[PDB]
Amino acid sequence: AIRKKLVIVGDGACGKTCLLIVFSKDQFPEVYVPTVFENYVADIEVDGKQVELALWDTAGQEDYDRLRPLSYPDTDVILMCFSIDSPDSLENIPEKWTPEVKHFCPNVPIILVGNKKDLRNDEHTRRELAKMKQEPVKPEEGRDMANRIGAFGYMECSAKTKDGVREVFEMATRAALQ
Amino acid sequence: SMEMDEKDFAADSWSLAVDSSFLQQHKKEVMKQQDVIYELIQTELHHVRTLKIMTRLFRTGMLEELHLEPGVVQGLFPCVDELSDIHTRFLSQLLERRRQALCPGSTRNFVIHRLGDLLISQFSGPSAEQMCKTYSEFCSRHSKALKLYKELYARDKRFQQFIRKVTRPAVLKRHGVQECILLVTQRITKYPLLISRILQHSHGIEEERQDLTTALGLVKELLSNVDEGIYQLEKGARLQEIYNR
Numbered sequence: 477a478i479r480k481k482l483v484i485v486g487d488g489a490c491g492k493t494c495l496l497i498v499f500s501k502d503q504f505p506e507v508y509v510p511t512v513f514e515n516y517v518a519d520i521e522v523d524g525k526q527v528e529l530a531l532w533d534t535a536g537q538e539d540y541d542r543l544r545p546l547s548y549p550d551t552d553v554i555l556m557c558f559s560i561d562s563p564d565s566l567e568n569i570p571e572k573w574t575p576e577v578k579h580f581c582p583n584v585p586i587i588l589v590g591n592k593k594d595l596r597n598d599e600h601t602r603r604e605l606a607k608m609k610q611e612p613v614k615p616e617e618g619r620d621m622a623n624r625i626g627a628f629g630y631m632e633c634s635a636k637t638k639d640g641v642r643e644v645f646e647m648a649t650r651a652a653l654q
Numbered sequence: 655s656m657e658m659d660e661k662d663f664a665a666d667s668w669s670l671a672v673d674s675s676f677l678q679q680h681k682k683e684v685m686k687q688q689d690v691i692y693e694l695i696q697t698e699l700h701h702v703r704t705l706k707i708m709t710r711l712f713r714t715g716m717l718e719e720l721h722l723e724p725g726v727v728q729g730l731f732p733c734v735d736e737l738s739d740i741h742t743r744f745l746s747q748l749l750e751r752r753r754q755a756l757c758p759g760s761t762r763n764f765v766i767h768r769l770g771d772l773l774i775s776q777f778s779g780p781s782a783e784q785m786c787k788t789y790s791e792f793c794s795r796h797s798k799a800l801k802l803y804k805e806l807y808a809r810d811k812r813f814q815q816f817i818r819k820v821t822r823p824a825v826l827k828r829h830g831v832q833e834c835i836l837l838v839t840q841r842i843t844k845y846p847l848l849i850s851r852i853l854q855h856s857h858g859i860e861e862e863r864q865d866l867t868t869a870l871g872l873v874k875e876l877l878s879n880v881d882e883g884i885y886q887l888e889k890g891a892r893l894q895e896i897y898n899r
C-alpha cells in the first residue's frame with residue numbers, strides 16, 4: 477500500500493473538522509462530537525489500488541500565517557472546503573486560500589468541496605441568510621468557482637447525513653495517485 | 655502512556671467514562687462542560703504519548719542502534735526533552751485535578767468545576783515564557799527536521815531498516831517521524847478551540863467564566879508571540895539569503 481498525504485483547508489466555520497471526523501469513524505457521532513481532530517491514516521482501496529491516506533486538519537491555524545504553512549510539506553491532495561450555508565466562506569476561496577495553496581503546494585491537485593449540502597433546503601438557513609440579502613450557495617456557483625481556481629474537480633457532501641463523504645475521500649485518493 | 659491513564663481515558667466521552675447512575679445525577683449543561691474538559695485531558699495524554707514515542711522509541715533507539723554523525727539526532731528531534739518536560743508537567747496537573755475530584759469509592763466518577771485557574775497558571779509567568787521559547791525554536795526547525803529525515807531514509811540502509819522495524823506495529827500507524835513532528839506543531843493551535851468550547855458551557859459560576867476568559871486570552875497571546883518568532887532554518891542557507899528575507 478502506497479502512503480499519500482491529504483490536508484483540508486478552508487474558513488473556520490466551513491465544517492472541515494466534522495468532515496474528517498465522520499469519514500474516519502464512518503459515522504456521525506451519536507454521543508459526543510469532538511472539538512478537534514489529531515490525525516488519522518485511512519486504508520482506502522480505489523479502482524483496485526490500495527492506499528494508506530494520512531488526513532490532516534488546518535483548524536485553529538487560520539489566524540497564524542507562520543504556523544499554518546507547516547501543515548503543507550509533501551501534501552499529495554488538497555481538499556479546499558466552504559460551507560453551502562455560507563456564501564462568505566465561498567468568497568474567501570479565490571484570492572486567499574487558492575494563492576496560498578498554489579504557493580506552498582505547487583502542482584498538487586485541489587478538490588473544491590461544498591460542505592453542509594443538507595442546509596441548501598433548510599428553512600431556518602434560508603430565513604437567516606435572507607436578512608443579509610443572501611441565499612445558500614447554488615450548485616452552479618460551486619462548479620464555477622472550482623473551474624475558475626483551476627481545481628481538479630468539484631464535489632458536495634453532508635457530514636451530518638454522511639451523503640457524499642465516502643465519494644470525496646475515494647476521489648481525493650485517485651487525485652493523489654495521478 | 656501508562657495503563658491506569660489509558661483506561662481512565664478509553665471512552666469516547668466523559669458521559670461514557672462515568673457510571674450511568676452518576677451521569678443521571680447531573681444537568682445537561684454540566685455533562686456538556688465535562689465532555690469538553692475530558693477531550694482536553696484525553697488529547698493532552700495522547701500529545702505526551704507522541705512526545706514519548708519521539709524521545710524513547712525514535713531518538714534513543716537511533717543513539718543506541720545506529721552510527722549517525724553527531725548532531726544528526728538533535729536535528730531530527732529538536733527540543734523534544736524540553737517539550738516533554740513542559741507537557742508532562744501540565745498533564746500531571748490536569749490528572750491530579752481529576753483525581754482529587756473523584757468520589758470516595760470510585761476511580762471514574764468525578765466533576766472538574768475549576769479548570770480556569772489551572773489554565774491561567776499554565777499560560778502565564780515562567781511556564782508561558784518557556785512554552786513560547788520552546789515552540790518558537792521547534793517550529794523554526796520543523797522544515798529542517800523533515801528534510802534531514804527524508805535524506806537519511808533515502809540514502810542510509812541501516813536507518814531505513816530501523817524506521818521500518820520500529821514503525822511496523824499497528825499502534826504506530828499514525829506516528830511515523832514526520833507525523834510526530836506535525837502532531838507537535840499542531841498541538842498549540844488546538845488549545846483555543848477546546849478552551850472556547852469549555853467556556854461556552856461554563857457560565858454557571860461567574861468566577862469560572864471569568865477565569866476561562868482570561869486563560870483564552872493568554873493562550874492567544876502565546877500563539878501570536880510564537881507565530882511572530884518563527885523563521886524556517888535551512889541547512890546550507892547563506893547569510894545573503896537570510897538578510898534579504
Ligand SMILES: CC(=O)Nc1ccc(C)c2c1CCCN2
Pocket residue numbers: 493494497509510511512535847851
Ligand atoms: C464542528 C466540530 O467538529 N467540533 C466542534 C464542536 C463545537 C464547537 C464550538 C467547535 C467545534 C470545532 C472547532 C470550532 N468550535
Ligand SMILES: CC(=O)Nc1ccc(C)c2c1CCCN2
Pocket residue numbers: 541542545571572573575576579
Ligand atoms: C501564509 C502565506 O504566506 N500565504 C500566501 C502565500 C502566497 C500568496 C501568493 C498568498 C498567500 C496568502 C493569500 C494571498 N496570497
